[PDB]
Symmetry: C3
């Protein structure tokens, strides 16, 4: 009965984002996505700590889905028989049925197809939510991602001017709760079910052992640093499905920031640090002015430096001595 | 000397709100309220955990008081002789004398009458604040509520359009600190005074044992679910006198949100999750589009699902398949 | 090559702020500041608890630096040989080289001179950031302050009207992590290096032992209360380099608040409590209407009353009975 064109999207792993238009002359379509749930034991730090992860499409965060206002998002959610638990999906962008959660509960061996109309613009969390105490556990195990619903005319600054990004990255931040044994070492478990009792006990005390971007300490550093060039406008979408975060680009700013993440509201300008409320996504754009390394952090610096929540940008281009210069290099005090 | 008409209000227990006008053709009046303090041992969870509560009018939160800009709010605060402690009241809506606290300290057996002019619009916390370390203790024991100061022309969207709600609910969120004994069971106490030493020790560690709406786990579920119909615009006032919260309506949105709670500022639009700073009230309105059950939570999902901070809405009306539909019910993977 | 006039500033200790113009007819200048790092053991509470502090210019917070948009800020950072550790400086107001941190690392016995162009208006954090796990440790040891970059036309309300303050105060809030011994007493250490292992262990658990303004419990009370008169417009700049805060003026309001701290955005009006994201500064102005004592707090009241985060204002002037009056003093219940 819904007679619109269908478009398939090939999702890509974060922090990258599948190809899409900002402004578009397309009208509404049914945009088709597939998410396959994977439960897996992963390594989350450089010491080799393991973690019983539960993921959409194998990644933490789940991939960014991008559509336009008035599109219909049709998701095939697949829970292979190789998984152990039921799962579902709640889209904060969607209206009704607990975001879709009440229509998508699938046992191992099942799949389901949900369609929702993208009536609200912005960046939004999606996450699993199977019921009761399982809700936080599946979310903090990694089962969360985001979806971006763009205006058909692209982004604007609330003063009539278009804001076009040259690239977009998705940084998903994950609070993780890994219990310790008596002597103080992190515990390893054979299954998510086996990890549950100790992990819930820790969860209820509200202090994570790790806070990471893209699923691991250091994920977005070295070979996998984010990149830009001087003169490039970069959009950084940041999500946190369970706990607050305060993003900050060290050596830069948020030129235009939607900290609550919703494009019906004008962006704020010229921020140092912004705030992602737990259960939300927000977005910040910045035009790089200087080359070199930047760190992108949550500005609880204990979390950033000690618990895992640091990414890098490596930026190419020409240094601008008008903006900053070392007038006198380090020298002995006279 | 103040020669205005007097109007009595009969307060009602949360989450309901006493009858009031949004837009009004009344001019300023002296609006008369009575709050009677009650210290009492209550049950706060489905396991039968007890808690030494201290309340305005017997409830957590204290009732919502509603007036209009330029009204004078005249409160008779009563501390019956059956209570054990001194108490007072600080209105964040008021100007001077620590919000009224410096003019309202009453021993058991006393009452006091305070008047303040409602010069600031919005939703505001009120709470007890007797001095020193007693301040946090009385607040986290339950002695907090809110007051709404409406513009005389009612609410607007900051773009010239009236925003009229069909109903309003007040959700007061309470962080509670219940100590445990050596074997890990919650402790019970014979009096607030007896609970104080153990409770303060826990308080200073900044992790609540319970986070509840309307005073108890499950208070706003089952028979006492919040209700609406498709097409109804519902205002949800949310307060937290001591600790941050991040409200979220699962399956809905905040169509118009004043997260800082103050009507001199335009609302933000189309939010997924909003943020109530500890020590404040905020407000969100939503027009329901779909029938069914919704959950209203703080979106720290550990707090929501595990510590008590979940309410339900039951919504009547016709399902809208354009907004959401289950294209294919759960089935075996091909 | 940069041929502008040079102006020296004599910094003053917080909460006071060096003399400056709001609106100015001066054009851009090179504004010269000197910061001398001091590592020192200090007393942080009325019980005599000691703390291994690391400071810019001897104070926590470091002093407020005030310039105008388009000025060049030239800082001589000095690390005397009497210190033990390397240090540097990151300005959130600056563009490039990790805010200056990558250009300012100095060993004991060295100094460095950094210049940055003040292209972003607002209040901004500055802090030390020597690398890795040292970053949070130096910040939570006290090595943070703020810089205010004013529009050349002064502040405005976003509706065309000037906002001129009669005085400005800088409240720097510091989360401190002081370990305890087995019997529960705070530990003392002979050096910052000796304090590091125990202090890091505690830091990673994300619960401070103390949260203070101006470096000590009670710093901004008694002789050192903040002051005002009825009719005076006071700007309160609040910073927190590592952890969120929720300022509140008990008995007052935020008449105009930039909670994200950036003057390119209009202020919000009529707030009760505002929110300083960790890693940022914000600012609130209030015109006092009533005499008497006010408390200025973070409205986690446990932190305010029990962990140290309370300042006072003493305000002179005439009481306004229209705004507030005690209709009936405390009396026996009829
Ligand atoms: O940036 C959103 C903000 O901008 C305003 C103009 O101040 O509206 C603009 O953006 C709307 C949503 O994209 C457009 O529909 C509108 O035409 C455009 O002016 C605000 O109304 C809005 O809050
Ligand atoms: O919603 C408050 C927001 O709306 C504006 C118009 O953009 O003012 C409106 O609301 C005021 C307060 O109710 C009215 O007095 C005013 O007349 C009306 O236009 C903003 O000024 C305000 O921030
Ligand atoms: O208060 C900042 C806010 O005000 C507006 C007007 O609504 O611009 C004013 O402030 C700018 C920055 O100081 C001035 O350049 C501008 O001329 C003045 O109108 C907004 O554009 C801005 O967000
Ligand atoms: O050693 N088990 O906690
Ligand atoms: O500047 N950030 O640590
Ligand atoms: O290298 N000292 O001047
Ligand atoms: O058993 N008392 O903590
Ligand atoms: O969608 N909320 O868990
Ligand atoms: O029910 N299985 O297709
Ligand atoms: O007594 N040392 O922790
Ligand atoms: O009103 N403040 O506690
Ligand atoms: O002092 N009693 O009315
Ligand atoms: Cu799941
Ligand atoms: Cu959710
Ligand atoms: Cu009390
Ligand atoms: Cu208060
Ligand atoms: Cu340092
Ligand atoms: Cu920083």
């Amino acid at each position: 009965d819904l007679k619109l064109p269908r478009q398939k999207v090939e999702l890509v792993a974060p922090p990258f984002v599948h190809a899409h238009e900002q402004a578009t002359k397309q009208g509404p379509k049914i945009v088709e996505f597939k998410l396959t749930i994977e439960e897996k034991k992963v390594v989350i730090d450089e010491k080799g700590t393991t973690f019983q992860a539960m993921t959409f499409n194998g990644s933490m965060p789940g991939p960014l889905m991008v559509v336009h206002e008035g599109d219909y998002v049709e998701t095939t959610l697949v829970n292979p028989a190789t998984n152990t638990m039921p799962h579902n999906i709640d889209f904060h962008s969607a209206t009704g049925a607990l975001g879709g959660g009440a229509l998508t509960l699938i046992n191992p061996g099942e799949q389901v197809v949900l369609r929702w109309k993208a009536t609200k613009t912005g960046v939004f969390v999606y996450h699993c939510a199977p019921g009761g105490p399982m809700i936080p556990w599946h979310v903090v195990s990694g089962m969360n991602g985001a979806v971006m619903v763009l205006p058909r005319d692209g982004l604007n600054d609330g003063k009539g001017h278009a804001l076009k990004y040259d690239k977009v990255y998705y940084v998903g931040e994950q609070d993780m709760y890994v219990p310790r044994d008596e002597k103080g070492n992190f515990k390893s478990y054979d299954s998510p079910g086996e990890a549950f009792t100790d992990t819930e006990e820790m969860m209820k005390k509200l202090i994570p052992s790790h806070v990471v971007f893209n699923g691991k300490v250091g994920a977005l550093t070295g070979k996998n640093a984010l990149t830009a060039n001087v003169g490039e406008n970069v959009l950084i979408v940041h999500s946190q499905a369970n706990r607050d975060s305060r993003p900050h680009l060290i050596g830069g700013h948020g030129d235009y920031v939607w900290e609550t993440g919703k494009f019906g509201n004008a962006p704020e300008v010229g921020l140092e640090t912004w705030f992602i409320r737990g259960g939300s996504a927000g977005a910040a754009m910045y035009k790089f002015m200087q080359p070199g390394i930047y760190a992108y952090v949550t500005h609880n610096l204990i979390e950033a430096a000690d618990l895992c929540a640091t990414a890098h940008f490596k930026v190419e281009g020409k240094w601008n001595d008008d903006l900053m210069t070392q007038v006198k290099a380090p020298a002995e005090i006279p």
